[PDB]
C-alpha cells in the first residue's frame, strides 16, 4: 500500500536471515570441523523515476536522478573456510587435515560425501567409519584383529603393527580431496558436503603432495566460529531489525491518521 | 560501534598471541610473538576533513621476535644448540635436498 | 476543486518519496559498500497573479506581489559517496577500497559494471568472482590450484604462494575505476552501478595512483547510513505528512459547508 | 546559470558535480556562477568562509585553490520573483544585484557541509488554517442569508 | 518543522562524532606511537530576532536582545602530540624518538610519509623497512650480510659489527623530521602522517641535535591515551546525547498534540 | 532523450516544440482539449519551449 512498508519488509527479512545465520554459528561452537557462515547483503533494484544523466536541456544533464530503492536482501550465505584450531586428544583413530583437503566417505545412496570432521571409529567388521552415522571412509581401511597399534602417517599411509612381527603391516592409504572453491559445496548436515556446479571438479591425491594438506593423527580440528564476532553481529542485527520496525510503525500510524482525517 | 568492534578484535588477537606464547613456554626453540597495531583513517572527496573521527584500530601483523633463548643441558651428544645466529636445515624427504 | 487541495497533494507525494528513501537507507544498514541517499526537495512553479516590481503609479512599483506557490516535490535523490568504516575479517578474498575507486565486474550482457562491495570468492574455475550472482571481476584473476595462500597488495597485485617455489608467483593485477561524479551513476541493485551521462568517463588505473584508492585485503567497507539521522528524519517526514493532510481535511469540510449552505 | 542564459539566484545549497567536474546543483544541474571546476587529481574539497574553494592533492602541501565563489545580495529580497526550483529572478522592486566575496560588505558567510532549513512555523500555519476556514464559512452565511431573502421577496412581492 | 528539532539534531550529530572520537582512542590503546585526539565543540550561528544593543528609544537601549542559537557542532578533532611512555624491548630494530621528531619513510606513490611508530624490520635485501606494509625508511639503511650485531646511537648513526674486525662499520645515518604544529598533520592510517598547510614546512636534521629528539634503540613509545579520561568522557557524552533526544521526544509529543487538537 | 542499455549517455530522439498566441481567448475550442487557430487568435509563434 505504501512504498516504505514494502521496503522495510525486505529489511526485516534480511535481518531475520542474518540472525538465523548467527544462531547457527553459535549452536555449532563446539562441532568438530565446522566452518562459520556469514550472510551477504545486497540492495534490490532501484525504481527509475528520473534518469541520472538524462538530458534536461542541451549541454545540461541530470547530475543525479530520482532513483528509489526497493530495500535489501540476503543474497548468499558464505562459508568462511578458514582453518580452525587443533585439539590434542589421546585417541588414535581421530585425524585432522593440516591445510586444504576433505575426507571422503561413502554415503548410503552411493555417492561420496566430503567431510572436514576427523572423529572416526570402527564398525563390527573393523572398517574405519565416521563416529556419527557410521559411514565408511573412502578408500576402505580395514584394521585386522591381528594388530596391536594403529599409526597413520602424514602422507595418509595407514599402517598397523602385528603381534609377533617386527614390521609395520600397511593396510591402507587415505586420499583427501581438495576443492578450488570449498565454499561452493552444498552442506547436507552431519558434517558432510556434496560437490556442486560452482564448487569445481574434485581433485584427489596423496595427502601432502600437490597442495593437499597433511593427515594429523590424534588431533581434531575445532570450529572456526568466533563467539565474540557472532555476539556483536547479533547485537547489530537486533538493532537494524528494530530500525525497520519503527519505519513500519510510523507508516502504520500515518495511514491510520489519513483514514480518520481524509 | 564498528570502531569499538575493531578495538575488541585487536584486543582479542593480542590475548590469543599471549596465550599462544604462554602455551609454548616448554617447547624447545620457540620464539615469542608480538602483536603490532596501526591506526585506521579513511577520507573521501566529499567528507569534511578537520573532523576525522578515526577509523578505529587495525591489526598490522603478528611478529616473530627472534631474540636468543636460554639453554638447558642434557649431557646427550645428539642434542645440539646453535649459539648465536643460524638455523638447522631439515629435509622432509631423505633423497631430495 | 481548490488550490489548497492541489498544493497540499503535492506535499503528500513529496513526503512519501522522502519516507521511501529513509526506509531504503535503514534497510541497507548492514549492506557492505552501501552509500546513503537524501531526498532533494524543491518548490514548484509560482502562479503570477500580480508581478512584483510592476509599476503601479509610474514612480511607485509593487515591492512584493501576489504569487501563489504550487507545492513541492522531490526532484532528485543524491547519494553521499563518503566512505564507511572498516570491518576486519579473517577471509583473504574480500577487499576494501581506501579512497576513491570502484571495483569493475563483467555483467552477463557483456557490459562492465562497477561496485563498492568487496565480498569476493572463487568459482569452479578459480577466477575471482563476486559472492552473489557470481559475476567475474575485471581483469580476470585466476587462482592456480597449486596456491597455498593469497595476498593482495596495496597496488592491487594479486600474489599467491606455491609450495616448492620461493618468490611468490603473481597471477594478476586488479584495477579500479574512479568517476568524477559517482553520485551520477545509475544504481542497478546487487551493489552495482552503471555509468551515465553525468557520471563521467570511467577513468581506470592502478589502485593507488592519480587519486585512486588503495586496496586493503581482508577488510570490508560498512554502510555509511546514519541510523540517528534516518530516525529523526522519519519524525520530521511523518509530522509534515500529517499536517498536509490537515489542509486537505479542512478543504473537504469547507466544500461540504458550501454545498449545504450555498 | 539558467538554460536561457540569464543568471538565477537561490538559497538552497544542495550542490554536486557533473561529468566535467563543474560544480552544479543537485536538481536540474545548473552550473553555479562563477564556474568551479574540481580537478580529477583532488582527494578532498574545502570551501572557505570567504568562498575560496580549494582542493588537496597528494604529493603537494598547501592545498591548491581551484576557484572563488561569489554570492549576491539584494536590498529587498521580498521583491524577487520566484520561478520555482528554489530559484528567484530579480525584479524592479528587488534592486540591483550587488555581488562580492561572501563575507564582505554585509554579505553572509559560506558554511560548508551545512544546509539551511525552511523557516516555516508549522504551528502558525495550523492556526492560520483555523481562522481562514471560519471566516470563509462565515462569508458563506451572508450569501446564504441573501439568497433566502431574495427567495422570500420573490414569493411575497 | 520546529526550531528545537533542528537545534537538537546538531546536538546529536555533535555528540556522535565526539563518541566516535573517544571510541577510536580506546581502540588504539595498544598502538605504538599513537596520539590521542580531542573533540572541540563550538556553537553555531545565532538568529538575530531582536538585536542586543539596539535602540529601544532615545536615551535608552536594549541591554540584552532575543537571539536564538542554531545548536552546536564538532569543528575539529585535535591531535594531542604529547609523548607516551617508554617500553623496553629485546629487539634491536625498534627505536623510540625521545623528544620531538618523526621517522620518515618512502610511500609507494613516491612521497615521504612520517611516522612516530618505531617497529621496524628488514626486507630481503637487508634494507630497513617498517614492520607493517614494509615501506623503506628514509634514508635507506642497508645492513650488510656480514653483520653480527646492530647498534643505533643517540645521534641516529646505525653501526654494525663484522666478525674478525674491530671498530663499528657505519652503514648509514638516520634523520628525523620536526614540525612546528604536529597537530596539523593529516593521518593517512598505518601510523603515518602527511604534512599539510597547517602543519608547516618540514625541517630535517640529525636526531639529538638542533632541537630534535634522540633515537633510543630497543625501545618503543606506547600510546598516550588515558583510558580513565576516555571512559569518563564517554559517560558525559552519553548524558548530553540522551538529554538532546528528550527535546526531540518532547517536540514530537507537542506536534502530535497539535495535530489532534488544531 | 532515452536511456539505452549497453550505451553510456542518453541519446536524443527529438525535441518537442510549443506555440504561443497573442490572444489565446481567440482560439476556437473544438472539444477534446483541442483548439483551432482563428483570425483573432493571432499568428502561431513556434519556437524552443522555454525561450522567448
Phi, psi dihedral angles at F51 (to 5 degrees) = -120, 150
Strand partners, F28: F36
DSSP symbol at B75: -
Helical (H) or strand (E) element with B14: helix B2-23
* Distance from C-alpha of B23 to C-alpha of A176, rounded to nearest angstrom: 31
* Distance from C-alpha of A208 to C-alpha of A217, rounded to nearest angstrom: 14
Chain B residues whose beta carbon lies within 8 Å of the beta carbon of residue C80: 46
Residue A57 C-alpha cell reads as 536541456
Nearest CA in chain B to E147: B85
* Distance from C-alpha of A111 to C-alpha of A185, rounded to nearest angstrom: 14
Chains that touch F (3 or more CB pairs under 8 A): A, C, D
Asked whether D67 and D35 are in contact (CB, 8 A), the reply is: yes
- Residue ranges of alpha helices (H) inside chain C are 3-27, 227-261
Chain A residues whose beta carbon lies within 8 Å of the beta carbon of residue D3: 57-58, 60
Chains that touch B (3 or more CB pairs under 8 A): A, C, D, E
Strands C128-130 and C120-122: antiparallel
**What residues of D are in the B interface, CB distance below 8 Å?**
38, 42-46, 56, 112-113
CA-derived radius of gyration, chain A: 27
Contacts 24+ apart (CB under 8 A), A111-114: A111/A194, A112/A138, A113/A188, A113/A192, A113/A193, A113/A194, A114/A177, A114/A179, A114/A185, A114/A192, A114/A193, A114/A194, A114/A195, A114/A202
Is there a contact between B37 and E21 if contact means CB atoms under 8 Å apart? no
Q: How far is D66 from chain C (nearest CA, A)?
A: 16
* Resolution of the structure in the document, Å: 3.2
Using the Cα atoms of residue B47, residue B49, residue B52 and residue B58 in order, give the sign of their dihedral. Answer: positive
CB atoms within 10 A of CB E230: 17
Q: D interface mutation test: which of A60, A62, A65, A66 has the most D CBs within 10 A?
A: A60
Chains that touch D (3 or more CB pairs under 8 A): A, B, C, E, F
Q: A interface mutation test: which of D5, D23, D29 has the most A CBs within 10 A?
A: D29
Q: E interface mutation test: which of D62, D63, D103, D118 has the most E CBs within 10 A?
A: D62
Residue-wise over A69-90: b if at least 16 C-beta within 10 A, else e? Answer: bbbbbbbbbbbbbebbeeeeee
Is there a contact between A14 and C23 if contact means CB atoms under 8 Å apart? no
Asked whether E7 and E248 are in contact (CB, 8 A), the reply is: no
Chain D residues whose beta carbon lies within 8 Å of the beta carbon of residue F51: 4
* Distance from C-alpha of E32 to C-alpha of A181, rounded to nearest angstrom: 38
Chain C residues whose beta carbon lies within 8 Å of the beta carbon of residue D82: 43, 46, 67, 69
Nearest CA in chain D to C71: D84
Got the DSSP string for D28-61?
Answer: S-PBPSSP-B--TT-SEEEE-TTSEEEEEETTEE
Residue C211 C-alpha cell reads as 587519486
Helix (H, G, I), strand (E, B) or coil at E128: strand
Q: What's the 3-state SS for E113-153? A: EEECCCEEEECCCCEEEECCCCCEECCCCECCCCEEEEEEC
Helix (H, G, I), strand (E, B) or coil at E98: strand
Residue-wise over A183-214: b if at least 16 C-beta within 10 A, else e? Answer: bbbeeeeebbbebeebbbeeebeebbeebbbb
Is there a contact between D84 and C45 if contact means CB atoms under 8 Å apart? yes
Partner-chain residue, chosen from C80, C81, C98, that has the shortest CB–CB distance to B42? C98
Q: How far is D147 from chain A (nearest CA, A)?
A: 31
Number of residue pairs across B and D with CB atoms under 8 Å?
Answer: 15
Helix (H, G, I), strand (E, B) or coil at A256: helix
Partner-chain residue, chosen from A40, A68, A262, that has the shortest CB–CB distance to C131? A40
Scan for cell 521526544, then name that residue: E249
Nearest of E110, E109, E130 to residue E119 by alpha carbon: E130
Asked whether E240 and E72 are in contact (CB, 8 A), the reply is: no
* CA distances from residue A248 to A257, E64, F24 in whole angstroms, order as listed: 14, 47, 50
What is the number of helices (H) and of strands (E) in chain A?
A: 2, 20
* Distance from C-alpha of D70 to C-alpha of D107, rounded to nearest angstrom: 10
Is there a contact between A54 and F9 if contact means CB atoms under 8 Å apart? no
Length of chain E: 262
Chain A residues whose beta carbon lies within 8 Å of the beta carbon of residue F50: 57
Helix (H, G, I), strand (E, B) or coil at E91: coil
Q: How far is F1 from chain D (nearest CA, A)?
A: 15
Asked whether D65 and D77 are in contact (CB, 8 A), the reply is: no
* Distance from C-alpha of D63 to C-alpha of D56, rounded to nearest angstrom: 4
Scan for cell 597485485, then name that residue: C157
Q: What angle do CA C57, C60, C64 make, to 5 degrees?
A: 115
Is there a contact between E108 and C243 if contact means CB atoms under 8 Å apart? no
Is there a contact between B55 and E37 if contact means CB atoms under 8 Å apart? no
Is there a contact between E252 and C243 if contact means CB atoms under 8 Å apart? no
Nearest of E146, E129, E140 to residue E94 by alpha carbon: E129
Helical (H) or strand (E) element with A76: strand A72-79
Q: What's the 3-state SS for D107-147? A: CCCCCCCCCCCCCCCHHHHHHHHHHHHHHHHHHHHHHHHHH
CB atoms within 10 A of CB B24: 14
* Distance from C-alpha of A61 to C-alpha of A54, rounded to nearest angstrom: 5
Cα torsion at C85, C87, C88, C92 (round to 10°)? -110
Partner-chain residue, chosen from F10, F12, F50, that has the shortest CB–CB distance to A51? F10
DSSP symbol at F10: P
Q: Which residues, other chains included, contact E70 with Cβ-Cβ below 8 Å and sequence gap of 6+?
A: E6, E7, E10, E43, E44, E45, E46, E47
Nearest CA in chain E to D120: E1
What is the separation of C-alpha E89 from the centre of its chain, rounded to a whole number of angstroms?
A: 25
Nearest of A71, A66, A20 to residue C34 by alpha carbon: A71
Q: How far is F4 from chain C (nearest CA, A)?
A: 10
Q: D interface mutation test: which of C53, C58, C98 has the most D CBs within 10 A?
A: C53
Q: A interface mutation test: which of B6, B7, B9, B14 has the most A CBs within 10 A?
A: B9
Asked whether E29 and E92 are in contact (CB, 8 A), the reply is: no
Is there a contact between F9 and A53 if contact means CB atoms under 8 Å apart? yes
Phi, psi dihedral angles at A40 (to 5 degrees) = -110, 125
Chain C meets chain F (3+ C-beta pairs below 8 A): yes
**What residues of C are in the E interface, CB distance below 8 Å?**
98, 154-155, 208-209, 226, 228-229, 232, 235-236, 239-240, 242-243, 246
Q: B interface mutation test: which of D45, D58, D64 has the most B CBs within 10 A?
A: D45
Q: How far is E31 from chain B (nearest CA, A)?
A: 5
Q: Which residues, other chains included, contact E219 with Cβ-Cβ below 8 Å and sequence gap of 6+?
A: E86, E87, E88, E89, E94, E95, E96, E118
Phi, psi dihedral angles at C250 (to 5 degrees) = -65, -40
Scan for cell 608547516, then name that residue: E200
Cα torsion at D123, D125, D126, D132 (round to 10°)? 150
Nearest CA in chain D to E260: D126
Chain E residues whose beta carbon lies within 8 Å of the beta carbon of residue C155: 108
Q: Is the peptide bond before C139 cis (omega within 30 degrees of 0)?
A: yes
* Distance from C-alpha of C181 to C-alpha of C179, rounded to nearest angstrom: 5
Strand partners, C189: C192
What is the separation of C-alpha D4 from the centre of its chain, rounded to a whole number of angstroms?
A: 19
Contacts 24+ apart (CB under 8 A), E121-130: E121/B63, E121/E93, E122/E93, E128/E93, E128/E158, E129/E105, E130/E105
Q: How far is F1 from chain C (nearest CA, A)?
A: 11
Asked whether A137 and A207 are in contact (CB, 8 A), the reply is: no
Is there a contact between B8 and A228 if contact means CB atoms under 8 Å apart? yes
Residue A204 C-alpha cell reads as 584427489
Using the Cα atoms of residue B80, residue B84, residue B86 and residue B87 in order, give the sign of their dihedral. Answer: positive
Nearest CA in chain F to A50: F3
* Distance from C-alpha of F2 to C-alpha of E259, rounded to nearest angstrom: 44
* Distance from C-alpha of C216 to C-alpha of C98, rounded to nearest angstrom: 7
Strand partners, E173: E157
* Distance from C-alpha of C243 to C-alpha of C227, rounded to nearest angstrom: 25
Phi, psi dihedral angles at B14 (to 5 degrees) = -65, -40
Nearest of E129, E172, E130, E165 to residue E151 by alpha carbon: E172
Q: What angle do CA C140, C142, C147 make, to 5 degrees?
A: 155
Q: Which residues, other chains included, contact E260 with Cβ-Cβ below 8 Å and sequence gap of 6+?
A: none
Helical (H) or strand (E) element with A103: strand A103-106
Q: How far is D125 from chain E (nearest CA, A)?
A: 10
* Distance from C-alpha of C29 to C-alpha of C36, rounded to nearest angstrom: 9
Partner-chain residue, chosen from D28, D40, D144, that has the shortest CB–CB distance to C262? D144
* Distance from C-alpha of E220 to C-alpha of B37, rounded to nearest angstrom: 13
* Distance from C-alpha of E92 to C-alpha of A24, rounded to nearest angstrom: 47
Amino acid at each position: 500500500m505504501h512504498p516504505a512498508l514494502w521496503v522495510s519488509k525486505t529489511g526485516l527479512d534480511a535481518q531475520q536471515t542474518n540472525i538465523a545465520t548467527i544462531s547457527n554459528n553459535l549452536a555449532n561452537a563446539s562441532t568438530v570441523g565446522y566452518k562459520k557462515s556469514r550472510a551477504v547483503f545486497e540492495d534490490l533494484f532501484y525504481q527509475n523515476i528520473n534518469q541520472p544523466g538524462g538530458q534536461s536541456s542541451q549541454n545540461t544533464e541530470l547530475p543525479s536522478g530520482l532513483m528509489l530503492g526497493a530495500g535489501s536482501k540476503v543474497v548468499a550465505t558464505q562459508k568462511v573456510h578458514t582453518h580452525g584450531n587443533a585439539q590434542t586428544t589421546t585417541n588414535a583413530l581421530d585425524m585432522m587435515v593440516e591445510g586444504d583437503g576433505f575426507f571422503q566417505v561413502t554415503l548410503p545412496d552411493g555417492n561420496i560425501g566430503y567431510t572436514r570432521n576427523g572423529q572416526f571409529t570402527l564398525n563390527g567388521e573393523g572398517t574405519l567409519v565416521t563416529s556419527g552415522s557410521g559411514y565408511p571412509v573412502e578408500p576402505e581401511i580395514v584394521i585386522p584383529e591381528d594388530a596391536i597399534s594403529i599409526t597413520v602417517g602424514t602422507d595418509g599411509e595407514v599402517s598397523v603393527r602385528v603381534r609377533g612381527q617386527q614390521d609395520n603391516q600397511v593396510v591402507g592409504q587415505l586420499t583427501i580431496t581438495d576443492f578450488v572453491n570449498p565454499g561452493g559445496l552444498e552442506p547436507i548436515g552431519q558434517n558432510l558436503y556434496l560437490p556442486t556446479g560452482a564448487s569445481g571438479d574434485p581433485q584427489e591425491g596423496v595427502p601432502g603432495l600437490d597442495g593437499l594438506g597433511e593427515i594429523r593423527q590424534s588431533m581434531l580440528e575445532a570450529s572456526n566460529v568466533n563467539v565474540t564476532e557472532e555476539l556483536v553481529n547479533m547485537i547489530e542485527a537486533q538493532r537494524v531489525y528494530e530500525m525497520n520496525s519503527k519505519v513500519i510503525s510510523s507508516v502504520d500510524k500515518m495511514m491510520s491518521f489519513v483514514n480518520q482525517q481524509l | 560501534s564498528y570502531v569499538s568492534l575493531s578495538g575488541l578484535s585487536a584486543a582479542q588477537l593480542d590475548l590469543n598471541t599471549t596465550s599462544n606464547n604462554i602455551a609454548n613456554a616448554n617447547t624447545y626453540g620457540f620464539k615469542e610473538s608480538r602483536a603490532e597495531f596501526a591506526d585506521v583513517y579513511s577520507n573521501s572527496l566529499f567528507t569534511n576533513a578537520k573532523t576525522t573521527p578515526g577509523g578505529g584500530a587495525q591489526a598490522s601483523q603478528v611478529a616473530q621476535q627472534f631474540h636468543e633463548g636460554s639453554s638447558i643441558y642434557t649431557n646427550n651428544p645428539m642434542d645440539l644448540r646453535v649459539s648465536g645466529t643460524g638455523f638447522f636445515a631439515v629435509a622432509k624427504e631423505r633423497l631430495t635436498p
